[PDB]
């Protein structure tokens, strides 16, 4: 019954993910539903790309979809066979009059980004791997990545009925209630053959003191 940690500290310590503006209540809904199709399309199509987040840059028929991933080779493909396909797919799903010129950039220390960690947990769970060993291994790798404590809790069918047997782990100072904490959050819906598995990962990346405002 607690608020999402990503939305609580949004706009006061973390910049907006889709920075743009347009005419009042006329077609901002159209852009809001169209650009989001890119955001969901990446996370659905390219599981192994390990994309962390994407930033949307729209102003008067121009779009710049910034991408952050650990393995850009899958997005690029072999001799640029996949970048043209992905950019033409984005064009077909966004329109024809807007220049796109996307970029693909590396992420520093990926193992401390909640999104890809949750994606790996979902992949491990859907791969019939026992939950405890995979979760412990991911915890160990993220802690060794050089971050603060982790809070992973997973619900769903834990290889059987009586789903209300969720498992949670905490291994360090994770002050969710502190706005000045710079806490990153993400969620993934692991889809096992028996039901739906929900994985939530909270990652602390050090305090954000003296940052003034959104970076």
């Amino acid at each position: 019954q607690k608020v999402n940690s990503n939305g609580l500290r949004f706009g006061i310590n973390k910049n907006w993910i889709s920075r743009w503006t347009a005419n009042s209540h006329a077609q901002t809904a159209k852009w809001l539903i169209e650009d989001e199709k890119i955001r969901n399309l990446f996370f659905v199509n390219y599981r192994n790309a390990q994309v962390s987040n994407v930033e949307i840059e729209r102003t008067q028929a121009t779009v710049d979809v910034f991408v952050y991933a650990a393995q850009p080779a899958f997005l690029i493909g072999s001799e640029n066979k996949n970048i043209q396909k992905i950019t033409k797919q984005i064009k077909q799903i966004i329109g024809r009059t807007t220049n796109l010129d996307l970029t693909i950039n590396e992420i520093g220390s990926p193992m401390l980004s909640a999104r890809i960690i949750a994606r790996d947990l979902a992949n491990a769970i859907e791969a019939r791997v026992p939950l405890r060993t995979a979760m412990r291994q991911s915890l160990i790798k993220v802690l060794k990545a050089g971050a603060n404590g982790i809070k992973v809790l997973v619900s769903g069918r834990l290889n059987g009925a009586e789903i209300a047997r969720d498992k949670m782990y905490i291994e360090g100072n994770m002050p969710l209630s502190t706005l000045r904490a710079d806490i990153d959050y993400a969620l993934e819906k692991a889809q096992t053959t028996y039901g739906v598995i929900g994985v939530k990962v909270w990652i602390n990346r050090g305090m954000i003191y003296t940052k003034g405002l959104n970076r």
Partner: protein, 101 residues
Amino acid sequence: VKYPELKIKLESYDSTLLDLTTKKIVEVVKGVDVKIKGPLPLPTKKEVITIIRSPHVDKASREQFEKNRHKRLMILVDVNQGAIDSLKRIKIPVGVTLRFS
């Protein structure tokens, strides 16, 4: 000249992001152009939205957001067409939108 009283008014949804842009503009125009009176704060036209939390009745526990919109105001006494030629390169970010005259 040939373009007196260039009243450029700009608004956005953030304060620091707009303050940086207006400082950059007032500094870049501070060359050949002269008599640029400082930025004029505006009431920050604001709108508040209230959304109930749960998908079910729960009507007694509702949260609410608030889409802020800041606003400043620049006015130029003389265009000094070299000044506007230099001004073509201000390259404002996406958050700040300008309404010219």
